[PDB]
């Protein structure tokens with residue numbers, strides 16, 4: 001059985017892992033059009049802030065290691081096209097230019113996504129950078145120590161834009177974050193959380209310009225100004241972190257795609273064509289909080305889908321369990337995590353929700369280490385089932401969101417969580433911990 005896997009990132013990598021323990025017998029070919037196998041863009045912030053010194057160590061696999069395991073790894077080789085009926089792909093060796101046709105029994109593709117660029121006047125003057133991959137990591141890092149870079153503008157105020165803004169603010173640059181949306185990180189957190197984070201970012205000389213449409217980049221050869229509908233901002237460097245586009249234009253006509261370019265797949269990761277499976281950022285995933293499919297471009301999702309494609313390689317025997325959209329990040333001193341439905345998610349899906357927010361010290365009054373923590377519990381107004389939660393503190397309490405993720409999947413209610421058995425010891429928490437306290441408040445709100 002010959003399986004070809006496209007992509008050495010999170011989705012393609014886990015497919016090769018699961019093939020190795022479920023089908024040791026197979027002839028496995030792993031293709032990667034780039035130069036470097038399994039670079040983790042996840043570690044870009046640690047590298048840009050100097051926590052990791054060697055960019056080449058920000059990876060989780062090497063080709064040599066997989067070859068030792070019997071996998072045929074092909075870096076610098078691109079899969080140019082798929083011929084689904086005759087079960088062939090044409091591949092192009094990018095160093096020699098030679099093209100060849102390769103046959104397969106099963107094909108698992110994890111083609112990913114590409115940074116969305118703004119197509120505006122000035123589109124690419126020099127020093128308009130993107131943030132994905134090893135090459136962009138290296139160039140961004142060189143700009144961190146460049147004395148000519150004083151003002152950097154990042155467009156986009158999501159996860160990636162706020163990581164870039166923090167990295168350049170910590171390198172001593174003046175940062176402006178510009179976005180059409182009204183709150184940074186709105187997709188992940190609600191207003192009571194982003195209000196605290198906005199103050200924290202402004203205390204570290206990041207200006208946040210929300211509700212503005214970028215119209216053109218101005219500059220002579222290299223960028224010098226970013227002008228929006230409302231303002232003009234000096235810029236020595238722009239980091240565009242507006243979003244991501246699925247890498248699927250080459251598949252139009254070969255596989256069925258949604259209007260937005262995402263590949264159509266079912267709960268067994270099968271595409272519209274026999275024996276080709278698709279995984280990762282280029283696909284939708286079952287979202288349990290709202291029982292619908294949503295595109296949630298996270299490493300966790302791609303890795304789980306990759307293993308489920310291999311489990312269903314021969315028979316559609318194992319439907320995907322679904323996910324809650326769990327994410328987490330530290331922004332300067334604050335560590336936050338969220339899962340499930342929040343306000344922006346409820347608006348997009350047309351879902352009605354209720355919520356309680358508790359803001360108090362997470363340790364008992366007599367313990368001098370006590371600090372404030374914010375916890376918001378989102379639940380269904382009719383059934384009182386748990387739909388989502390968001391937590392933030394300067395203390396790391398983020399692992400508690402893992403219990404909420406399971407609670408949503410298990411369809412537990414506010415009453416279940418109010419009396420759920422969580423340990424108490426006064427160096428770690430209160431007798432009713434952060435989850436118990438918010439759920440107890442929700443029970444009182446529904447009495």
Ligand SMILES: Cc1cc2nc3c(=O)[nH]c(=O)nc-3n(C[C@H](O)[C@H](O)[C@H](O)COP(=O)(O)OP(=O)(O)OC[C@H]3O[C@@H](n4cnc5c(N)ncnc54)[C@H](O)[C@@H]3O)c2cc1C
Pocket residue numbers: 006007008009010011012031032033034041042043044077078079080110111112113114131132133160247279280281282297298299300301302
């Ligand atoms: C800055 C940054 C930070 C992030 N941090 C986190 C985080 O901390 N936590 C989290 O869960 N997620 C994080 N993510 C998201 C996560 O990285 C993605 O969800 C994940 O990488 C998607 O994996 P993928 O395999 O679907 O696609 P991609 O990562 O986009 O990889 C696709 C791979 O396949 C290759 N390829 C594409 N076409 C071809 C072809 N035709 N032939 C051969 N090879 C090809 C590409 O070169 C690429 O290497 C982050 C993303 C970024 C950009």
